[PDB]
Amino acid sequence: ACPGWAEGTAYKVGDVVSYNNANYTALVAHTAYVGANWNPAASPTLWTPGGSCGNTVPFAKHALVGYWHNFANPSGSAFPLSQVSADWDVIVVAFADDAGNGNVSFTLDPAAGSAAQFIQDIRAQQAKGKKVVLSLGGQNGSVTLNNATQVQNFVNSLYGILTQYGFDGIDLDLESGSGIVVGAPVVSNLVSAVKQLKAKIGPNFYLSMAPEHPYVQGGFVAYGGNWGAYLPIIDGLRDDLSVIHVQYYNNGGLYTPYSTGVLAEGSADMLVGGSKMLIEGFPIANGASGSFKGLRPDQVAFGVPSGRSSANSGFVTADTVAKALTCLTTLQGCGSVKPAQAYPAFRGVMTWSINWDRRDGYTFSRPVAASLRQ
Ligand SMILES: CC(=O)N[C@@H]1[C@@H](O)[C@H](O)[C@@H](CO)O[C@H]1O
């Protein structure tokens, strides 16, 4: 085994230590001075991970979905797609860039290697049964779909990207900058755009959505502005939706019909409750008598932060995730929120992110994949 990382210790370049039961290799000869907290999970300038001493598109029945940073951030730089651990079932490349008007582009972070190597890495991951999809979102995640011309640019440019790189499909993580509100033209145009894109690609087209819960389950309690604004998008694309994994973080608690009070952020109940609403369906505070029709369990997963650096609120332990999963799948280990019937085909778990999980020593992916794996 590798020696545990410890403050007061002098390290040389190439030294391998154990931290959070994972390995890190020293990038710089240095001492971890006491009180500085220069630990491997917090210090990518000092440590790099590694070293030693229906019918929908077919993908993992119980899947671990994660986002792969096509950029550098406090988690560290991007890393080659080939090195994404086997615990991940769907690798979501984050992100594509808005190019306007309607146009989308993609440019690889050079730290991931050459475009040619990246394309080979995609094939190699697919050869192992993984899906590799392109996410719309992030810093340039403001898509304009206000007229038919922009829709066509959207469809054509994304078709070019997918066919060139061999992505299995797309992920929608774009709602915060794209003005997705009730009554906005983008709501109708996005559904039309995705349908047209898939028609060009074929039935292998993978489609996922990662909206924040006010845009979805929020509709139960309020319908206007962003609240409930994603529901007709889901409804319009339900035949094409591979999986929706709502982000149950950064937006406080969740009001469901399964408890007299809101379900607490970071609780298994909230994860179970949010998932129940998507599967059973729920009334919409329409003003009319509108309702959201439930999805198949295989179309539903829940999204959580991979760790403390991944979000501002809504953090969960691996144990909490495991509890929510077994509750949903086998009606066992439930809290105060219980499914009406078991969902043996519940799709699973999404996390931001693969990179943060890697930086933190696979503390999310390892136990959660094990839970999904039974
Ligand atoms: C007993 C043993 O082989 N332990 C190794 C460990 O030293 C290494 O850091 C880790 C990362 O690959 O893989 C383990 O299997």
Ligand SMILES: [Ca+2]
């Ligand atoms: Ca989102």
Ligand SMILES: [Mg+2]
């Ligand atoms: Mg944080």
